[PDB]
Structure formats: C-alpha cells, structure tokens
Amino acid sequence: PAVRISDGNLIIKNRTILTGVPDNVITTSASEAGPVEGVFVGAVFNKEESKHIVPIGTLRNSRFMSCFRFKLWWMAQRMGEMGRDIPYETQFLLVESNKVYTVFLPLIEGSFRSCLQGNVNDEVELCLESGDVDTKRSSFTHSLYIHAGTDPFQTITDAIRTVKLHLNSFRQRHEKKLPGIVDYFGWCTWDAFYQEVTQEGVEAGLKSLAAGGTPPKFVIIDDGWQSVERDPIFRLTGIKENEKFKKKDDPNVGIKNIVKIAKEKHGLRYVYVWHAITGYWGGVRPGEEYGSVMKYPNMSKGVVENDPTWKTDVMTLQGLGLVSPKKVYKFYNELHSYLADAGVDGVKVAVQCVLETLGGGLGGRVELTRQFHQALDSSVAKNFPDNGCIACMSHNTDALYCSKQAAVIRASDDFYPRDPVSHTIHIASVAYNSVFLGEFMQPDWDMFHSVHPAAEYHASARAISGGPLYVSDSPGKHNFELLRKLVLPDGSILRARLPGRPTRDCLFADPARDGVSLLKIWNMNKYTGVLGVYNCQGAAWSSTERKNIFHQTKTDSLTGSIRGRDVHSISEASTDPTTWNGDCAVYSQSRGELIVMPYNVSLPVSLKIREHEIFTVSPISHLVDGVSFAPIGLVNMYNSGGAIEGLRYEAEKMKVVMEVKGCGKFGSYSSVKPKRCVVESNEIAFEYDSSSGLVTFELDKMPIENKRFHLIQVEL
C-alpha cells in the first residue's frame, strides 16, 4: 500500500518516517477517485471543539523543508531534521528519505482548516481550527494528505491533484486562464508615491519609462486612489475614486480620465487598480448599503506565536467594518462595475488573509473566506473577463484550497527598497514558496526598482520567475540598460513557462541559513531551460527575535556548481528526447561565455552575498557526427531562450529552422562554422567563435506586418 500506519508507526515504502502515532489518528484511501496512492489522515476526539491539536507522530533524523506563515499574510522557508524545528503555522511540509520524498498537505475539511506545528518532543502536530466558537467538530477524516514518490516536484503535483479531486473547490495553476498582463512589462505606483499617488503621477511614470524605450503595457494604480476616511485606521467611504483621480476641469469625470490617458495617449493595454478584500484596510464605514458592521480580528495561537506584533496591530485594535456576506457580491459588483465601465481591466486584491480572523459567528475562517472569494470571483468574471485578479497578502490554505479561478498570486512579502535585510530574503522566499503556491496559481515575484544596489539581483530573479514583470520606479529613476535586459521595444517580455523553483539540490538545504550553499532556481522555456544562481546567505527570519534580521556568516564567498540536469525538466526542451544524451550548451548571461557541458559534468560557480549569475541551458542536438547545435536566444536578455518560439532540425539538409521573437543580438551553439545564416529569406552577416562554438547575428528590428516572429534558417 506504499503509505501506511502499522504498529504505531508511519511507514513509507518500508521506511519508518514517524514513530508513536496515537491510537485515535485514523487513515483512509477513499475519496471520489476513490482509491488513492497516498493516505488521507484525520482523528477522532472525545468532545466537540472549535479547536483541536493532535500528534501525528514523532519525527527525527529525516531532512524536511517547510513553508510556514511568519506573518498572517505571508510564508517563508524553514529546513530541519527533527519535529521540534517544524514551525508553527506550517502549511506545506516535504520530507526526504535517504531517493524518496513525502508531502504532507494539511487541508481544509468542512468548516475547519488545519496546519502543522512541531513540539518539544519532536512530534508533528496537526492543528485543526474553525475560527468560530459556534462551529465545533469531534472527528475528521481528510484533514491531511500524505503522498510519496521519487520525483519531488511530481510528487507535489500528484498530491495536489488528488486533493483537488477530493475537494473540487480549486483548480490547478495550469488549468486556469492567465490574464494578458503576464506577457508585458508593467509599472506599479506603490513604491513610487505610496498613498500620495495622483493621476498626474500616474501619467508621469508611464511617460518616463516609455521615453527610454521600455514601454509598460500595464499599470497598477496601487493603494491611494480610493475614497477613504478616519472615524488611526482608514475605512472606505464610497466606491469611487478620490479627488486626486478626478479630471481637473469636469470633476464629474473620475478614474476614467487616467485610464483614457494611459491607454489612448501612452499606449497601455491594461489598467489595474488596488483594493483590499474588505474594501480598505479598516474595511468599509459601517452602514446599511453593504451591511458593514464593526468586527475585531480574532487572534489564533500559531499566528501570534510567530507574529506577536499582530496582537497590537491597528487592524486588531481598531477593527474593520466588515461588509455583510449577504451583501458582499453586491459590494464587489458595484465597485467593479464602476471600474470596468471606466475602462479598468483588473484588480490587485490585498489584505486577503484578514477574513480568517473575522469569522466570528459567521461559520468561521473557512466559510467566511469561501463566501467572499465566491463573490469576488463572480464579480471578476463578470467585470474583468480577461481574468483580471492578482491575489495579494493571501498565503492561507483557506484561500488556496478555494482558488478556483484567480490565476496570479503574490509569492512573498513586499519588495522593500529601503530595507537592506529584505533582498536576500525576498529571493529565498519567492523561490521556496513557489514550490507550493505555484501548484495553485502563477507566482508573482513582486515589483522592484531598476535603480538600486540590488536591482540586478531582483531583476534577474523576476526574469526567471515565470510571473509578471513590473517595476515600481519613481518617474525618472530608471536604469534602461538593465530594463532592456527584461523588456523589448514593444513592451513584451520573455516569460518562462513554469513557476521558478529551487533545484532538487536546493530543496532541503537552506541557502539563507546554512552558511554553505548557493540557491539555484530553475525554469523552462519551450526549447531551453534557465538557471539562476544566488548567494542569499546572511539573513532570514529569526525564531528568537521573530522578525527578519541579519546573522553571522562564515565567509563572504561561496562556491557551488551547476549541471545541465539541475534544470529539472530540461528534457522537455529537447526536440528528440529519446535519442538525447543529456549534453547542454550553457551560456553565462553575465560573463557572456558559452560552455559545452556534457551530461552530469559540473561547472563551479562562486558568488559573494547578494551576487547572482544567470545561465541559459539548451539541449544540444547531434545532427551527424561532428555537427551539433543548440539555440541560446537573445543573449543580452536575462531569459534569452524565451525568445525561441519554434525550432526544427533537418539533418538531411544540415539545417536548423527557427522562429524567434524580439530583436537584438541572437546567439546559438554550433560545432561547426555556419555556411549561411538566413533571416526572412535574406542572408545576413554573423560572427563565429571557433573556440566556444558561439554563433551571433543581429536581429535588427522587431518582426513587422504578417510576420509576428522572425524566421531564421542556419545552414551548417
């Protein structure tokens, strides 16, 4: 049966993973399916309670990785090998047996949500909570799912899918419609003006970016456009824009003014706006219209253990006007109808995890979350039918397991331009949280600044994230040399196809805390892989201080290495995987060096703290003995291989035929010097380094007219 409890142990393919499983912990393999590869786990208790905790078993001497909420809104990573190091509010746990990987997914069941936490005795406890004193249960059968396999990424995905088939209450990332903003450069007003944003500031930012040749095609009008008032917390007073967004003649005209300027005058395709899941930070001003009533956040133990300041946050103490569940659809619809009729294409929806703290006597955290998201999704589908929703501050399983439609999720805590501790931590967080969040939605690695000491560090990460790419530059503060590595002259980006994630290598070694390893992040394009390597040692969240701090490091520089197969799915980029020997052409985007890397050969990589390097990794095709080739792409862009749309080898003609998007310097590996390089039927000059095999030529202009991609032929 693979995964079983017998004696009082949890045994996984004949390895004891946990010992000392209580008698009252019960397992099953039924569901809709119903027979299922892993096991659902639950428990039976003596009394009704609105909260239970129960040990599942004792964990020692097995490497784990977990994603845990260090704050209400957000996860980060913690590695370890003893149950006692498992954090409070662990939402995802992956265990290694030394070859075999086991995932533990704590679930929502009925009105309860579960997570895991470690205790002093090295037990893994499941914590089940309804968040409502009137909602009480005593037995549970599907509050946790455990599944094992030999490919850690495949293991995760198969488990999520099994759970989906059981709950039917979410979709997987790959089944959802991504909104069109993901394929374009954007700009977000948040770090540029904070709440003092005005419509003139919006226009200024768009114009400055476009004037340097990297034009955004979406904008996020972030927090500060809405009509809010104090009663020191602010609450929503109406659904329309404030005075800063009213045309300065004609104050009857509203946010439609800036939207039309953006799109007709500056060429934007999309405009999004920010709002809280509750309207604003303090909710909506109490009243009949939407049934808003003052409510005060309930504290749960796990959240407040990791985040003690939450007990004295302004939202906790001054409360929120919570719109009624009976009127929530109407609130979202009236807000979104106003927005859509003004030309707005989507919303960035923040403050999402507050609902779990307000389910009071409304059925609790799960039911309240489900209700609000049901209404929000209906409103988004009606009013922003490109699927215009970015989920923000939303890392709770209550929202993840009801993620049926929305397709983009902020993968971490905010970019912080002025906080030096944050940069290394940001890269670790987005990468590790993406392992799990990217099963539900496309991860958004957040805005950044192009003029900043960490700009390249952040920029390169976004380029391999698989997610939307956007800066929050103040108008005029741009580095366009850096932005041209991310954005083409029409505002399109080279987006990779998957959530960027750590390599198998990096899943159980904490590169923020171990003092010894470099973080390596992989993604895929259609005909190449990509790999970024980061030193992010020297800072992380503190179990003792309970916030992000710097910590001692043994040295500045670390040396690790890369292999072609670190790009876990690199196979899928090969045009003939069954004959492929595993050799890759590896192009260092930062050094500009092409290296041939045979299957399993390592290359050493050395980096100091806050340094990085990006490598495009392309499968080599052996056309005949001595004639071998791999495309690289737009070598002056971070995610070079994202430019290759089509690739075909004709060994009988010793030819390669490609479809390439974009413009700039194009590169490929060839063992031999080409006879000819042809672009749309004309022959063009090229360079060839005989020593590395690097072929380069210039793609002068974007494709015009009926072309849409450059058609390139390379004759060898």
From Swiss-Prot:
Tell me the enzyme class.
transferase
What causes induction of this gene?
Answer: By oxidative stress and by dark treatment. Down-regulated by sucrose, but not by osmotic treatment.
Q: Which Gene3D superfamilies match?
A: Aldolase class I
Keywords of this entry? Carbohydrate metabolism, Glycosyltransferase, Transferase
Q: Which GO terms describe its molecular function?
A: galactinol-sucrose galactosyltransferase activity
Catalytic activity entry:
alpha-D-galactosyl-(1->3)-1D-myo-inositol + sucrose = raffinose + myo-inositol
Documented EC number(s): 2.4.1.82
For this chain, the family text in UniProt reads: Belongs to the glycosyl hydrolases 36 family.
What is the recorded function of this protein according to its Swiss-Prot or TrEMBL entry?
Answer: Transglycosidase operating by a ping-pong reaction mechanism. Involved in the synthesis of raffinose, a major soluble carbohydrate in seeds, roots and tubers.
- Protein name (database record): Probable galactinol--sucrose galactosyltransferase 6
Q: Which organism is it from?
A: Arabidopsis thaliana
* Gene (name only): RFS6
